[PDB]
């Protein structure tokens, strides 16, 4: 698994791979690792697939109840804290979760919280979680600026997952992109890593080590 999310001028970019493995066996290459909590909030899947799916879908239910009761969009702070407080009750029972809760509101602006199954809740600008996280971080840290365009930020997220998909055995399949704005997230397609690798190699001149 490789998942990332980062804050920038134009909101948030979320990018994930698509691979799921049981040991060395590749179970699926078509896993949806971005959970669409609601039209304005996104979450990322790492650790336990069920734990992430179940509890972030549940989170969407809690966010919906909040806005019915309070007649106002839930803050990313409040939404993330509902999830972190829930998993904290289950601490010790064996939940497995490493997620980025991503949203863009008026009062906060673009906001990302890293939430985690041992209770951690961290606000931050750049997060990378999964077996291929270290590979993605390298590309992110050396190319990240606040003043990136939406086009360039989308590519940077795509390229960073590709880096991890190449090197990490347990990351691959395809890349799913999202752009989170104040008016909601926008899906920017599924991109096969096989086809993407060769396309990027040629156009960028990278991966000279690999014969194409």
């Amino acid at each position: 698994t490789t998942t990332l999310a980062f804050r920038f001028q134009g909101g948030i970019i979320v990018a994930v791979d698509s691979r799921a493995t049981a040991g060395n066996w590749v179970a699926s290459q078509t896993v949806k690792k971005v959970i669409e909590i609601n039209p304005f909030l996104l979450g990322t899947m790492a650790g336990g697939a069920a734990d992430c799916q179940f509890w972030e879908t549940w989170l969407g239910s809690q966010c919906r109840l909040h806005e019915l009761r309070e007649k106002e969009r839930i803050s990313v702070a409040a939404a993330s804290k509902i999830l972190s407080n829930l998993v904290y009750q289950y601490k010790g029972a064996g939940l497995s979760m490493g997620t980025m809760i991503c949203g863009y509101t008026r009062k906060e602006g673009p906001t990302i919280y890293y939430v985690d199954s041992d209770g951690t809740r961290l606000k931050g600008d750049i997060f990378c979680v999964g077996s291929g996280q270290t590979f993605a971080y390298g590309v992110l840290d050396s190319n990240y600026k606040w003043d990136l365009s939406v086009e360039d930020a989308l590519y940077l997220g795509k390229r960073s997952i590709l880096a991890a998909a190449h090197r990490d055995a347990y990351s691959g399949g395809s890349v799913n992109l999202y752009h989170v704005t104040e008016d909601g997230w926008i899906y920017h397609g599924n991109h096969d890593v096989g086809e993407l690798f060769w396309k990027v190699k040629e156009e960028e001149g990278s991966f000279n080590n690999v014969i194409g």
Binding site: N24, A169, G194
Partner: protein, 204 residues
Amino acid sequence: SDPSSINGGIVVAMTGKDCVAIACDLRLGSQSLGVSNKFEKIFHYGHVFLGITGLATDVTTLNEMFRYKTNLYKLKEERAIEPETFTQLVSSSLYERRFGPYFVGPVVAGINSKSGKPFIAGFDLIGCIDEAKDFIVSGTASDQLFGMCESLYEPNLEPEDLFETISQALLNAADRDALSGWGAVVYIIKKDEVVKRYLKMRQD
């Protein structure tokens, strides 16, 4: 922890009409980390081809060991070793480390120079010989290869038909294994020509 799946990779061998084919992926890794995309697993001693999967240090060591032994064989016998004879040499050599074995999956492929008969064989890490006429598989995607080979394979394929069969068997098996891929090579072997083809595949 498991020595046979630290580095990853696969080998497959097949028989056809007056020919054999042997193929392997090019990956070497340290568990999750991909390390090399140029780690070939097929070697040859004269006209006998040997593929080896498993622990990469043992792959290299055994190649060096069989080069050593087949070189001395040739000097003494005044002829190149044959696939049937070599198969027994591999088995013997593996079993002499019965209680401290090499963690490998060897596969032999070749055509007997005198009879013209296509030959393929496989072994377990301690030398038990799997002697089958259709196909031999080995590595971390051996299950996947068994599945591909059982449904794609048919007997008496012409060299270029056999190339397509073994290539598709390798490629699609490798793509369902985290620890295999990163390139692939296919040898098409006839009685007095050998064609080596590198395949284009996904690099994740």
